[PDB]
Each structure stands twice: as C-alpha cells, then as structure tokens.
Amino acid sequence: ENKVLYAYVQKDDDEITITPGDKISLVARDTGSGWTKINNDTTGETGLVPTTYIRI
Ligand SMILES: [Mg+2]
C-alpha cells in the first residue's frame, strides 16, 4: 500500500501536510521539481508534498 514515510507540514498554499500512517493517493508524479501531487484521504486535502517523503 501507499505510505507516508516522513512527516511534512504545509508551507505554501499548494502544499499539504502528511504524517506517517495517513492514507494517501496519487494525483500526478514528480516531473523533476522534487514534489509529487497527492490526496491525503486521512485529512481530506490535496496538494504537493516532497517526493522522497512518500511511497506511491
Ligand atoms: Mg502558490
């Protein structure tokens, strides 16, 4: 299953918070920015997180 490995707190409007154990789903893979767009179904939010912090 998809995983949050490392916690990240939102820092700009396009980002979202993730914490280990949250249920996530992919929106769009990183194209070279270092960020992946996801949904966090635990929190209900959608946006960018650092790619290395998750496994999708
Ligand atoms: Mg912005």
Residue 25 CA to ligand 1 center (angstroms) comes to: 21
- Residue 44: give its domain's CATH number: 2.30.30.40
What resolution in Å is listed for this PDB structure? 1.0
Rounded CA gap, 38 and 14, in Å? 11
Residue 11 CA to ligand 1 center (angstroms) comes to: 10
Give just the sign of the alpha carbon dihedral 33, 30, 28, 55: negative
Rounded CA gap, 40 and 32, in Å? 21
Give just the sign of the alpha carbon dihedral 28, 49, 14, 19: positive
Give me the DSSP letters along the chain.
Answer: --EE-S-B---STTB--B-TT--EEEEE--SSSSEEEEEETTTTEEEEEEGGGEE-
DSSP bridge pairs for 9: none
Residue 22 CA to ligand 1 center (angstroms) comes to: 24
Structure tokens at 40: 């966090």
Residue 55 CA to ligand 1 center (angstroms) comes to: 24
Sequence length of the chain is 56
Side-chain-side CA neighbours of residue 2 (13 Å): 16
- For this PDB entry, the determination method is X-ray
Domain carrying residue 37: 1-56
Total number of domains in the chain: 1
Q: Compute how many other C-beta atoms are within 10 angstroms of the C-beta atom of residue 40.
A: 20
Cβ(50)–Cβ(35) below 8 Å: yes
